Design a protein around this motif. Structure first.
Motif, short mmCIF file in Angstrom:
data_model
loop_
_atom_site.label_atom_id
_atom_site.label_comp_id
_atom_site.label_asym_id
_atom_site.label_seq_id
_atom_site.Cartn_x
_atom_site.Cartn_y
_atom_site.Cartn_z
N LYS C 155 0.70 -1.46 -0.26
CA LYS C 155 -0.23 0.46 0.40
C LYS C 155 0.93 0.97 -0.15
CE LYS C 155 -2.27 1.06 4.00
NZ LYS C 155 -3.40 1.40 4.47
N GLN C 156 1.93 1.36 0.88
CA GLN C 156 2.92 2.16 0.76
C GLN C 156 3.65 2.56 -0.48
OE1 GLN C 156 5.90 1.93 3.82
NE2 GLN C 156 4.66 2.59 5.24
N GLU C 159 0.53 4.54 -2.65
CA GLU C 159 0.55 5.90 -2.27
C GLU C 159 1.42 6.74 -3.43
OE1 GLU C 159 0.03 5.82 1.72
OE2 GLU C 159 -1.94 5.74 1.35
N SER C 160 2.85 6.19 -3.01
CA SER C 160 3.97 7.14 -3.40
C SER C 160 4.12 7.08 -5.16
CB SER C 160 5.01 6.23 -3.33
OG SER C 160 6.00 7.12 -3.56
N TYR C 161 3.61 6.05 -5.90
CA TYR C 161 3.36 6.00 -7.22
C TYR C 161 1.82 7.38 -7.65
CZ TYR C 161 2.21 4.56 -12.07
OH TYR C 161 1.58 4.60 -13.28
N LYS C 163 0.48 8.94 -5.69
CA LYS C 163 0.70 10.85 -5.04
C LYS C 163 1.51 11.58 -6.16
CE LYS C 163 3.94 11.86 -2.03
NZ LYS C 163 4.19 12.79 -0.56
N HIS C 164 2.61 11.13 -7.09
CA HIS C 164 3.71 12.09 -8.49
C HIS C 164 2.46 12.33 -9.15
CE1 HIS C 164 5.33 11.55 -12.77
NE2 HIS C 164 5.80 11.65 -11.46
N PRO C 167 -0.71 14.83 -6.10
CA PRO C 167 0.10 15.06 -5.09
C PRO C 167 -0.32 15.89 -3.83
CG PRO C 167 0.61 16.57 -6.90
CD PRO C 167 -0.06 16.12 -7.71
N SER C 168 -1.61 16.04 -4.85
CA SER C 168 -2.64 17.02 -3.89
C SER C 168 -3.37 15.92 -2.39
CB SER C 168 -4.18 16.98 -4.39
OG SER C 168 -4.48 17.04 -4.81
N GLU C 169 -3.62 14.51 -3.13
CA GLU C 169 -3.38 13.74 -1.99
C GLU C 169 -2.44 12.71 -1.79
OE1 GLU C 169 -6.92 13.99 -1.81
OE2 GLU C 169 -6.48 15.39 -3.20
N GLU C 170 -3.08 12.21 -0.10
CA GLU C 170 -2.16 11.21 0.23
C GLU C 170 -2.50 10.01 1.54
OE1 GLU C 170 0.74 13.94 2.85
OE2 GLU C 170 0.14 15.73 2.30
N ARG C 171 -3.64 10.28 0.67
CA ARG C 171 -3.95 8.72 0.89
C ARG C 171 -4.81 7.71 -0.21
NH1 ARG C 171 -5.68 6.41 6.21
NH2 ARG C 171 -4.09 8.56 6.78
#
Lengths: 185, 185, 262, 260
Positions: C155-156, C159-161, C163-164, C167-171
RNA sequence: CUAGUACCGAUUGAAUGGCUUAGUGAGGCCUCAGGAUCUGCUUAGAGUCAGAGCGGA
RNA sequence: AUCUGGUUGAUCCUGCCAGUAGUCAUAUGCUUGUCUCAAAGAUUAAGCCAUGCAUGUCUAAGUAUAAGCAAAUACAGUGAAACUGCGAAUGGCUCAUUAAAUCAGUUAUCGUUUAUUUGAUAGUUACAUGGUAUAACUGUGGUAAUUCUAGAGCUAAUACAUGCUUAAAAUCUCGAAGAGAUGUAUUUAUUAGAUAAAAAAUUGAUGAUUCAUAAUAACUUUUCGAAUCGCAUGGCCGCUGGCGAUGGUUCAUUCAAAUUUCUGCCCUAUCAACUUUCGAUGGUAGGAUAGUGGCCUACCAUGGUUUCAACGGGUAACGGGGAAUAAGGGUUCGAUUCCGGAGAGGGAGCCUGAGAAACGGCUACCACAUCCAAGGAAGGCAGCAGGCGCGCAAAUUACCCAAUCCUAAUUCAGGGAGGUAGUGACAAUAAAUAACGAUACAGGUUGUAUUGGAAUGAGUACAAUGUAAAUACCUUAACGAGGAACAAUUGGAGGGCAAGUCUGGUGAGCAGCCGCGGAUUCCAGCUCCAAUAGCGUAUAUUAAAGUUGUUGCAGUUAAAAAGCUCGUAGUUGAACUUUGGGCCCGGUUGGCCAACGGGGCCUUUUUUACUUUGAAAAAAUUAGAGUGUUCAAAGCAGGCGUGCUCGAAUAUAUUAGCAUGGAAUAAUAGAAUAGGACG
């Protein structure tokens, strides 16, 4: 709520960053004693600063003032125990003459070099972090550990390692196995 | 309701004050009894700590002292004649501490004529007692002349609104002269 | 001090009244529906798994067919939703569907990572035409269970993918967990979308039904969503070009009064 | 507040209890009783923190409900009962007796006593007065009221009380040359003899004390408790006899003995 | 042409707040009254049979 | 502690600016491997809130016939409902109001109330009274709806209401004998509660009382003085007896409350006069209160504060312990872990109780707002978790009473108080990313490139340990490195200020400041520098800053001496009074002696300021002593033989009040119509 936990900061930053003559003096110490940071130097000069502040304060008090007697003797006693101050210079005026190299000389990292065992201050650091050195019975793995004068007799390899008498390490065992298996081929 | 706080007053310099807090319960007051002559009616009020006060509304009889003679009698109260604080209390026959009233005289006469054996206007045991007492049978002329009409002046000394009962003493000396002047003026 | 305080209070009254004026459009069954679009980035997923897991947390099985557009009322949040599913075969039809949505739900797979030749090109293209709002969702992360710490490691990475591009979203939510899926459902009901500048300055509607009359007189019914309509205007349909409307009515009638453009 | 308070936050507790900072949010609040809050010692602190006979608050209650512990000869079961200065505590099993008395640092010591001495306690006379029907009585610092005292007894005198029956058997006058125990302030825990007293009408009287090393100090009269004649304490004194030492003297003794 | 910046000043449009003239005033509390009901005693209804009369809530 | 750069073509000053370092000061950008520790919707909006939870409680010992369960003919184990008793006034949250108010240190009650704990304390007035009685229960019902409740029939008490029983004597009143009265509580009026010392015509306390207490005559609509419960089963020939529980009058004590003395607070004169009708200052009497007092009423007098700043206005103002910044003096901050105050959307009122002007209690109005059958009903997250709105700006609708403690009739029940885990680059501590040989080459044992064995945790995992149960740390079998891709970033290279005459392009970009460019300053590539698991930017503040100056600035020509003189408040003010000399004792330190301190004797022998010593000034924080947490930040522990034993120090803390030693410096008073001293 529960009472607050107390904490404090342990170093100080030099107030002029690009004083060229200072940059040269620091780099010689790091190369001599095998430090990784300037912070390791700042930490020591921060401690030395406070010792002088206290000592200089006491010297305003008259001799035979009961406070100067009590606390002055404590400070001297405590520095002699680690070997930073010689028991010949066992007087408060000489505390103002200490310098940084007097403390770095006492770190476990350098003592393990002066005794033999290792063969460079860079080799000494590796052994400590890899859990090969013990002081008394206790394995110690912190390079900045200050060796008190009593302990120097008891620095040696740990019982639970190669070099100390235990089984060979993971890589030696793998090599013996492949060669033994091939020798059966 | 009524409050006894000092917060609402001006300061001694004349400054006005802002409101510090809401009215607290521990500083309340209550409305007056305004007790009248009538037939006995008493209520009770629950005060701080769970104690009691009695709040007399109508009263008709009280306990009065003949202080120079040293005896007390229960007797009926006739009316209010003078009040130092406010003349409206006279018009309404309101009873309070320090009101001046007239009381029915007959219980005191009956005591007197039996005790001293002499009219105020038979057997050996009685005559012997009167003879011993006879030296003290004299009485103030300003008092004795009241007994022809059957009423005496008295002053209320209890607080009827706080304790529920009306008690007092007969006017007797320099006080009697003072109020007689005020009363005839 | 008094008039200082008074001004601040009556200014706040305007702000609060203004917030209500925005929200009234969605206020209930009498209000407009919100348009949701589901876009799975991998064919592994099947979009019906995404919608189904959402509908469960509505906690009304009366909500839960030979069709790809669905109208739903959610009692739990007193909210009206329209769901549109695109045909994932027609790449151009994806853009047209997503062009009209308030919320685009991106489906991600924990098992197979998006392919650069197709899956990413969906994301890249949608960004450049503009998107009213976006949500990242996972639906199948338990397919790689050994211990849920191994699920967290994946899942981490997702999320890193994700957010590229956003970038306004982190979940990124995991719908296999009731708490996440309820959280997603609440957001779609309660929150307002961004505007789309080039769209909202025009009028647009989505067809509830279509009918034909005699060269034809095509009838459409739906809901107004843009700046508005006037019977003297001109109307574009993306596959077919420009056409003229002759009448409007409100479900009063308006007619094309010929003092009009041509 | 709208009424009495039931909780005592830690850090606000009396410092001489020697609670640690971090083990919890609260401290035991003493119940109403014979001794003032600020200078009592709750039973929970005695059994758990000093004697180590209990590991938990729960285990302390398990002891008390068996009725093993009695204070001044009576069984008590309230965990926060406020014992205080000069009280006698008895544990019948184990066969131990203790008297609460201060160390020279101003802490309650763990002081053991014989089965004989457990019979009595001392009390300081706080007032003497006539009750209803004209019967005179005295009041002690631990709040006892005793009928028909000897007409010689006056305020500030000290009185010996039999714990059974609860009746007076002896007394000592407040006068020069008596031994005293200091029970408050900066000099709490010292012992010496009275040199003289200062009268201050409408103020606080001051007393001058001398100890057996002939150091001298001054305290308010309220802090003074008489305990006997010169050289003849009426009770066994704790170890170290109440002689205060300077910090230099203490350091020398430790490294001499403990440091060999 | 557009942007920016302000003044009056019309509607009181249409509101919010302070002071103030005149008039009114919820509610509980204290107090003068009222008495749906319930019930004790009493010459007296019967060997519950009524009525009256004197009290308490 | 004491820097550097910028004003002529060429200089020295004044002056301000730029640079530098810190921040338990917030935000934000790029980057992120390990161990310990840890703040967290204050700032704007004391704005609005879906759903769940946050306060109840029983022992041998108040009330049991459940038609509950489980096995000594009145009952006897366990035990739902309900009556009774106690608690819900503590805790938790927030900082809107508030400038002699709150608060801090220090006082007072001889001016008052107090559930509970602890200790004292009632010979004084039937072998067991009544429903003026009822819940749970049984049974008949109403309404769309709520913790709605009606009519009928039963029965208990430590509920409610009544009412007995036990010695002798003395004194006083009435009248020869007799007869009558007396405890305690309430209300009033009288009496005692003494006191320096002698001769004739019994008695308490205080600095201090109308104190404590006692006596006499009466008063009350009539207070209290046991109609209660468990266990045990003795003694004497139907009488008498033990250990406890719960109540009760008054006094004392403890936990407390209310009021109160002295001194202390930020900016403003573009606020100089303010208060008194309608209490402003004081006197007498009354009412009301637990109690003092214009607290309120009647009558009467004309007072009270102020240039030593009253009154008025402002605060993006809750006060204090404290925090940052270390030459010294200061400047700035404190919504926030402890202490005190206030509030529960806004105002007002009140019931119950020992205690509330209570909001997880009630009633009304104002503003919002929920359900409906349209008749009506119900409401208060600035408790925990969560949502909307706001904005630069802040976490999970999780597990548990195992620890710390609190409440109840209680060892046992309950507690979002509290603890555990999740999120978490706020701040803080320790510390990986490689070490060593061989060979070739060069140098004097040190550099530059092909090659070889050893070493280890990051990670994963059997197991045990950990824990309420778990996760993680500490320990450990197996596995786990050669481009050891198991790959460290963030800003710079003219000067201030460490480091490029490199090389290609160009003629929009850089730059806090001076400046570069129609190229050492832009853009790209090499190389180099600095700090490093961290580094940069914005805003505020402190230091360097002697640009706020008491220590400690400046006023001819650079900003700044008023046209001139008088003069009230304010600040300031000449010299002088017991000085000197002898003789004892005498402590400390160093060599009987010297120095430095101190006491006594002789010689004609009113009121303040200031300074010394002492008691006081909560804990945490600060300074600081001891102690191998593997070191350290921490913590208050821990040592020794393998039962014994040392600890948890000490200091600082303006000013105001209290006790005490001194008599220099600076003020005040005294005998001149003598009206003076000693007599």
């Amino acid at each position: 709520p529960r009472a607050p936990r107390t904490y404090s900061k342990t170093y100080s930053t030099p107030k002029r960053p690009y004083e060229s003559s200072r940059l040269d003096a620091e780099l010689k110490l790091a190369g001599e004693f095998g430090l990784k940071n300037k912070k390791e130097i700042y930490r020591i000069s921060f401690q030395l600063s406070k010792i002088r502040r206290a000592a200089r304060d006491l010297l305003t008090r008259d001799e035979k003032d009961p406070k100067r007697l009590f606390e002055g003797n404590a400070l001297i006693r405590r520095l002699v125990r680690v070997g930073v101050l010689s028991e010949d210079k066992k007087k408060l005026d000489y505390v103002l003459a200490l310098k940084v190299e007097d403390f770095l000389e006492r770190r476990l990292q350098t003592q393990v070099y002066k005794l033999g065992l290792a063969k460079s201050v860079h080799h000494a650091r590796v052994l400590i972090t890899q859990r090969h050195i013990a002081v008394g019975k206790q394995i110690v793995n912190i390079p900045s550990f200050m060796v008190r004068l009593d302990s120097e007799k008891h620095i040696d390899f740990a019982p639970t390692s190669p070099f100390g008498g235990a089984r060979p390490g993971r890589v030696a065992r793998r090599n013996a196995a492949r060669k033994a298996e091939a020798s059966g081929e | 309701g009524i409050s006894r706080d000092s917060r609402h007053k001006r300061s001694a310099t004349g400054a006005k004050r802002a409101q510090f807090r809401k009215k607290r319960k521990f500083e309340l007051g209550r409305q007056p009894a305004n007790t009248k002559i009538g037939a006995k009616r008493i209520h009770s009020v629950r005060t701080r700590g769970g104690n009691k006060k009695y709040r007399a509304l109508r009263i008709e009889t009280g306990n009065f002292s003949w202080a120079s003679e040293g005896i007390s009698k229960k007797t009926r109260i006739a009316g209010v004649v003078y009040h130092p604080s406010n003349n409206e209390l006279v018009r309404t026959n309101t009873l309070t501490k320090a009101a001046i009233v007239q009381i029915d005289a007959t219980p005191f006469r009956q005591w007197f004529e039996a005790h001293y054996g002499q009219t105020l206007g038979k057997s050996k045991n009685a005559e012997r007692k009167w003879a011993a007492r006879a030296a003290s049978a004299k009485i103030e002329s300003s008092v004795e002349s009241q007994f022809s009409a059957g009423r005496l002046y008295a002053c209320i000394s209890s607080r009827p609104g706080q304790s529920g009962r009306c008690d007092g003493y007969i006017l007797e000396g320099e006080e009697l002269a003072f109020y007689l002047r005020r009363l005839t003026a | 001090k008094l008039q200082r305080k008074n001004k601040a209070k009556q200014l706040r009254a305007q702000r609060i009244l203004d917030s209500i004026e925005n929200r009234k459009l969605f206020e209930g069954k009498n209000g407009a529906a919100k348009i949701i679009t589901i876009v799975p980035l991998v064919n592994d997923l099947d979009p019906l798994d995404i919608l189904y897991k959402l509908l469960k947390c509505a906690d009304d099985e009366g909500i839960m067919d030979s069709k790809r557009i669905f109208n739903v009322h959610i009692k739990k949040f007193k909210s009206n939703l329209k769901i549109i599913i695109p045909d994932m075969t027609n790449f151009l039809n994806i853009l047209d569907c997503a062009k009209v949505a308030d919320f685009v739900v991106f489906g991600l797979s924990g098992v197979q990572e998006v392919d650069e030749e197709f899956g990413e090109q969906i994301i890249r293209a949608l960004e450049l035409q503009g998107i009213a709002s976006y949500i990242g969702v996972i639906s199948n992360l338990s397919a790689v269970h050994e211990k849920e710490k191994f699920q967290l490691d994946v899942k981490q990475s997702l999320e890193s993918y994700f957010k590229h591009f956003f970038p306004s979203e982190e979940r990124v939510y995991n719908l296999e967990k009731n708490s996440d899926a309820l959280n997603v459902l609440r957001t779609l009901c309660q929150r307002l979308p961004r505007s789309i500048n080039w769209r909202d300055n025009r009028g647009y509607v989505v067809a509830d039904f279509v009918d034909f009359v005699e060269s034809g007189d095509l009838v459409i019914e739906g809901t107004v969503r843009g700046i508005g309509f006037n019977a003297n205007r001109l109307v574009h349909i993306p596959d077919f070009g420009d056409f003229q409307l002759n009448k409007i009515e409100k479900i009063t009638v308006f007619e094309s009064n010929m003092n009009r453009d041509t | 507040a709208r009424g009495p308070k039931k909780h005592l936050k830690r850090l606000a507790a009396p410092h001489h209890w020697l609670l640690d900072k971090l083990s919890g949010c609260y401290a035991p609040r003493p119940s109403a009783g014979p001794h003032k809050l600020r200078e009592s010692l709750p039973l929970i602190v005695f059994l758990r923190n000093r004697l180590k006979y209990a590991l938990n608050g729960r285990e302390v209650k398990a002891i008390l409900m068996q009725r093993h512990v009695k204070v001044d000869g009576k069984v008590r079961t309230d965990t926060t009962y406020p014992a205080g200065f000069m009280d006698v505590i008895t544990l019948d099993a184990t066969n131990e007796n203790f008297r609460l008395v201060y160390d020279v640092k101003g802490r309650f010591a763990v002081h053991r006593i014989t089965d004989e001495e457990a019979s009595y306690k001392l009390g300081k006379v706080k007032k003497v007065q006539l009750g209803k029907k004209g019967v005179p009585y005295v009041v002690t610092h631990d709040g006892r009221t005793i009928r028909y005292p000897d007409p010689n007894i006056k305020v500030n005198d000290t009185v010996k009380i039999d714990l059974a029956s609860g009746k007076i058997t002896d007394f000592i006058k407040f006068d020069a040359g008596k031994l005293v125990y200091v029970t408050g302030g900066r000099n709490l825990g010292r012992i010496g003899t009275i040199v003289h007293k200062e009268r201050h009408d409408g103020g606080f009287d001051l007393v001058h004390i001398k100890d057996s090393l002939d150091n001298t100090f001054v305290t308010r009269l309220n802090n003074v408790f008489v305990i006997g004649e010169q050289g003849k304490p009426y009770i066994s004194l704790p170890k170290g006899k109440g002689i205060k030492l300077s910090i230099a003297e203490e350091r020398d003794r430790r490294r001499a003995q403990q440091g060999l």
